[PDB]
Design a protein around this ligand. Structure first.
Ligand SMILES: C[C@@H](c1ccccc1)N(CC(=O)N(C)C)C(=O)C[C@@H](Cc1csc(N)n1)C(=O)N[C@@H](CC1CCCCC1)[C@@H](O)[C@@H]1CC(C)(C)N(C)C1=O
Ligand SMILES: C[C@@H](c1ccccc1)N(CC(=O)N(C)C)C(=O)C[C@@H](Cc1csc(N)n1)C(=O)N[C@@H](CC1CCCCC1)[C@@H](O)[C@@H]1CC(C)(C)N(C)C1=O
Lengths: 334, 333
């Protein structure tokens, strides 16, 4: 076909990038997160216990105000690495920047405070294959593709950096030659079903101080940070001088602007992040500490163990999620 | 051609703005400073001596690492206003934005603490004309032009106030996201150098400095605006700034109090307020804030000149027009 669409994204702190979707007629608008580590949608439910503060604090979907709605009803649990969310399935029309799909989605009626209370977005839009969908429900894009609108069978990520800007943007169908420079480098996934890519190594410094003899890289938009297995990060951090705490990694602020280059030996290229890319310099004091933008995560099999290239890296490199030919391409951005 | 290549820039303390470049095959990455005041490209040699604490903390070029690398060994001393550096000439491919070109880069081997240590980046990329070149080696832009890939033979500069995005260079034109209105150019007095002529420095209402013509280098790799010791001396008096052990400070609390400083360029006035000159770390009556202007005596031939640095560039988006050999300005955003 010939459709191209955007979805304008709001960059909230370099940690959260959400768009907006509408469900039901009249539309009920929601701040969702576009997530290539999942294949499901879900948005708070009217039916949700108000004893769930997140449910007091977000926008709930009320089906009784949706003439376009078809009760389904199956319980589903969406457990993500940072938190779980049980609910049940409904169906209605979703409007995703341009495209209308009768989406099969889920009414979250148990929304935990941790993390959700710190969430700026209401729900999530999974952009991973059906080979991961809980309940085996045909995923949003999978529906846009069965629609024959799309000029091209790809979706691309642009993640801006903050402003005191244009936050980011997805493009369903195409790519945006005003977000990148040069040309793409294509890496083609291992199995289909997961956005993974083989990684030939990780160089903090110059020396491949990690992933020598390869490892795997999952490409995910729903990840604020870069993640690497526990020991993998233990070592990286070690190299790097970083203080391991509870949730994040730290560094004397002043220390920041000199932390060495870290590189991803990806599909043959070397994808380097300099410390201006992984260091949240909110200062240069010897007294204040500074939060890196990399952090462990042990991902259990079957997907894991993997490195997860989140928001951190998509911010430096435009990413082309290519369904047709089944591969992912990156470009340097603008 | 029809390309255009931005290079995102880091801003270390509103004083240093540096981007990345990659040399050789495979590309090897360094942090550089794109200098309109210089015309040689140089980065540390791996051949650089450990005793130089400097090379010690700075990215180095292992030529063994580049397949494309080509030998030249012709010795090079580069001598800047705040330092002299020195090594020999090499030849590889350079990446700049999505652009890639073979260059005559210098591979540094004698590099001092002062200033070298100050530096957060590793090298320099001189956006100067050939004319002002050591070894008379064609400057980087000089090649790229010839590559015939870029739409316009111009490069823009956006310096950002620090608090993000700290700057960005446009090789091939301008990023209209970063300027307000249109440019008002200013012809080069003459090729070779990036210097226009100023018709007067104002303190509020009146010209005081530069009553009958002066020079102004618009320079990207100089932090502060500079004047001759003797004009700046006059300048700090109208202000009531005081030299303090090093440079001129103010009682922060009195920032808001100071007269706008005005650069008469090509008929129009380029006007900087306190907001833009003082580094108001605070608004304390208890603190001294420092100004972002310095006395800096440039030698003949290029001197005496005023020199608009990052201070001024922060305000006025700069357009370096190779083609017309003019310099255009516009309000950054
Ligand atoms: C803590 C969590 C969070 C908190 C509040 C609000 C929003 C998000 N964060 C922010 C965060 O990590 N920092 C450091 C602030 C995530 O990025 C969440 C990210 C954690 C992570 C895992 S690997 C990595 N690099 N980061 C994740 O779970 N991301 C989920 C989807 C989330 C989208 C936003 C709503 C919550 C679910 C799947 O991408 C991950 C990836 C995959 C497939 C391995 N897997 C099974 C998952 O569950
Ligand atoms: C210390 C020096 C520096 C150098 C290296 C690293 C860190 C800092 N600094 C910061 C500085 O002086 N303050 C006060 C922040 C410069 O701005 C440097 C600037 C000083 C200057 C001269 S006129 C003026 N207003 N400011 C300069 O010498 N700039 C050089 C090239 C430098 C680029 C960064 C690496 C060190 C060399 C040419 O632009 C100048 C311009 C000209 C024409 C005077 N000439 C011959 C030069 O060599």
């Amino acid at each position: 076909g010939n459709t191209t669409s955007s979805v304008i994204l709001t960059n909230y702190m370099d940690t959260q990038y959400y768009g907006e979707i509408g469900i039901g007629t009249p539309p009920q608008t929601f701040k969702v997160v576009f997530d290539t580590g999942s294949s499901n949608v879900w948005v708070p439910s009217s039916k949700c216990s108000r004893l769930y503060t997140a449910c007091v604090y977000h926008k709930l979907f009320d089906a009784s105000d949706s003439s376009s709605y078809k009760h389904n009803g199956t319980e589903l649990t969406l457990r993500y690495s940072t938190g779980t969310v049980s609910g049940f399935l409904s169906q209605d029309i979703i409007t995703v920047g341009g495209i209308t799909v009768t989406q099969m989605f889920g009414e979250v009626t148990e929304m935990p405070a941790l993390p959700f209370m710190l969430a700026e977005f209401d729900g999530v839009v999974g952009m991973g294959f059906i080979e991961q969908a809980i309940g085996r429900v045909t995923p949003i894009f999978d529906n846009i593709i069965s629609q024959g609108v799309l000029k091209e069978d790809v979706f691309s990520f642009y993640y801006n950096r903050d402003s005191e800007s244009l936050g980011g943007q997805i493009v369903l169908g195409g790519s945006d030659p005003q977000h990148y420079e040069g040309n793409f480098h294509y890496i083609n996934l291992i199995k289909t079903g997961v956005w993974q890519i083989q990684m030939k190594g990780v160089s903090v410094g110059s020396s491949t101080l990690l992933c020598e003899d390869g490892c795997l890289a999952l490409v995910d938009t729903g990840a604020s940070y870069i993640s690497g297995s526990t020991s993998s990060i233990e070592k990286l951090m070690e190299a790097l001088g970083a203080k391991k705490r509870l949730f994040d990694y730290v560094v004397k602020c002043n220390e920041g602007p000199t932390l060495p280059d870290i590189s991803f030996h990806l599909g043959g290229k070397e994808y380097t992040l300099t410390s201006a890319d992984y260091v949240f310099q909110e200062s240069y004091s010897s007294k204040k500490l500074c939060t890196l933008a990399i952090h462990a995560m042990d991902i259990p099999p079957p997907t894991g163990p993997t490195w997860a290239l989140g928001a951190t890296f998509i911010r430096k490199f435009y990413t082309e999620f290519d369904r047709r030919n089944n591969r992912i391409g990156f470009a340097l951005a603008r």
